[PDB]
Design a protein around this ligand. Sequence first.
Ligand SMILES: CCCCCCCCCCCCCCCCCCCC(=O)O[C@H](COC(=O)CCCCCCCCCCCCCC)COP(=O)(O)OCCN
Ligand SMILES: CCCCCCCCCCCCCCCCCCCC(=O)O[C@H](COC(=O)CCCCCCCCCCCCCC)COP(=O)(O)OCCN
Ligand SMILES: [Fe+3]
Ligand SMILES: [Fe+3]
Lengths: 277, 277
Amino acid sequence: TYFTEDQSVDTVNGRMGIDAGDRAAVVMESLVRHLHSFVKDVGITQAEWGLAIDFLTRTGQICGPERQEFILLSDTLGVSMLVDAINHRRPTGATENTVFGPFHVEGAPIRQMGDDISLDGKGESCLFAGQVRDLDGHPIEGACVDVWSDNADGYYDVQQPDIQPQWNNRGRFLTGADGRYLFRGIKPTAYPIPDDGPVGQLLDRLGRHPYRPAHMHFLVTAEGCERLVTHTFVEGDSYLESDAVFGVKEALIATYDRNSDDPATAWSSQYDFVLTR
Amino acid sequence: TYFTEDQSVDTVNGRMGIDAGDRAAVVMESLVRHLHSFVKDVGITQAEWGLAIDFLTRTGQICGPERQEFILLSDTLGVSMLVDAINHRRPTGATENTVFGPFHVEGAPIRQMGDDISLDGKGESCLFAGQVRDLDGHPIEGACVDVWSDNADGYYDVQQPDIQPQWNNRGRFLTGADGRYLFRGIKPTAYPIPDDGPVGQLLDRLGRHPYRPAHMHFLVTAEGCERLVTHTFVEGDSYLESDAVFGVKEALIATYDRNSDDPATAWSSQYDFVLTR
Ligand SMILES: CCCCCCCCCCCCCCCCCCCC(=O)O[C@H](COC(=O)CCCCCCCCCCCCCC)COP(=O)(O)OCCN
Ligand SMILES: CCCCCCCCCCCCCCCCCCCC(=O)O[C@H](COC(=O)CCCCCCCCCCCCCC)COP(=O)(O)OCCN
Ligand SMILES: [Fe+3]
Ligand SMILES: [Fe+3]
């Protein structure tokens, strides 16, 4: 007949004109099924529906050059981490992926080893070093170590374009024959995700804080290897067990050593990445 | 301790700081549960995730004074009809609700009975008439009949702000003691929902058309009665069995009679509304 509540799912899915084995049909069949199930499960009202419409609208409207509020929504509802988890499984011993987040920027300067990526000098100086190897234990020559962090104010460069220098706490480093990287930066600082839009509103309404534990992002790539999209977390950070975006993994926690002794930098963090074929 | 695929839902929901019985917690618990189930069900890829982010973003960004693309998305996935369905359980004999759609505009001119709502004179003239009553059969005095339709070009006034006169095919009528309404308009025309944004892209990808059968919208309100948000459909419209927004109900299909004899209007359509509660 016409639409009924009991046949809502079949009614909507049955309008599709594409073959059932087309990937879009498989995805959309499940999306509609789950969406209808949700609405029925909690009895979404007309007013609640209107709230949702308004929220989704504002979420897209606040997106633009320096802000991806839909990524933040995905991130804070654990969707991003879940997508990473089911797609980027790897053997024991290989460094684990985690949530990408929205603040990677392609085409960062290719810098020299030992260069200082902290261009505004805000934070405590830190020496970052380690080795890229394959799963069989061999250093990889010509791996690209693409790194990004916030500054001491809790912001990535792209969040404060007219304040932070371009490429602040960003750089790309290409390993030599020994697989080693080394650069100077600052010790990362815990930061709230942008909380002045819908995502911040929702966290507030759920009695959730917006913070992530301090971390340095590493995107490590090499010919013939799976792309490693990860971060290292500052050991001891108070938010390690309450990351707003669910990104922490035990093995990604990095030690930070205080350097009275080597006063080139105040801190050092050593961390080795292991890629798979 | 940390996020795992198999504990993804508990991990995310467990961060809520509000009481389990708070409406936001009930809704969001189910939203996260269903959203994670969906992602797992069909194995959303990183690329698919990225496509969704972009799509949701564009959907919100194209919203504005004259277009609610999130409503259209809700409508075309059957969510709007479903929310209307589960929030109404009216008695036998009361006129049924259906999908609101995005084109109602508050504060339409209060017109006299017999006034013509068709200001651009595009379409075949039609006389619309009927009676508002209660379930016991008594006319309702002082009901407001708030009506809106497209013009012959298949657009609501707000979709062509520089072309259509303001309030074209819109008006509010207040019933007298006999409960009767009467106005002149045009016979409505089948129309595609706006198909140049994400929603149109999606329908195209699913091999679905963007069309609705011809209809006149009626929002009927009265003191002490449930708000009636409905439409009447043009009998015999070839899209009655394939409404893009699933809004058709048998009882809302209206008969249209041709008037050779009184060529004041070409057509007349008589339809009574029965309010409840
Ligand atoms: C294509 C389909 C599109 C439509 C699909 C429908 C989806 C429905 C799911 C969302 C429904 C959630 C809303 C539940 C409302 C009740 C509890 C939460 C908020 C609530 O209390 O509502 C209001 C306040 O909310 C606030 O101030 C903050 C709430 C923020 C908005 C609600 C959450 C948005 C939904 C998240 C997006 C969906 C995820 C994307 C995949 C006012 O009520 P009150 O009781 O506080 O007032 C009394 C004070 N005097
Ligand atoms: C919290 C945020 C969550 C973040 C998102 C994660 C959730 C996963 C959602 C995944 C949806 C992807 C499904 C699309 C199928 C793609 C695979 C088929 C092959 C292909 O490339 O087709 C594209 C289809 O994508 C398209 O048509 C573009 C994608 C459109 C799908 C998005 C619909 C989402 C519904 C939102 C409801 C709100 C829920 C609130 C609780 C072509 O591209 P094309 O078709 O454009 O080109 C043609 C113009 N006809
Ligand atoms: Fe980050
Ligand atoms: Fe309409």
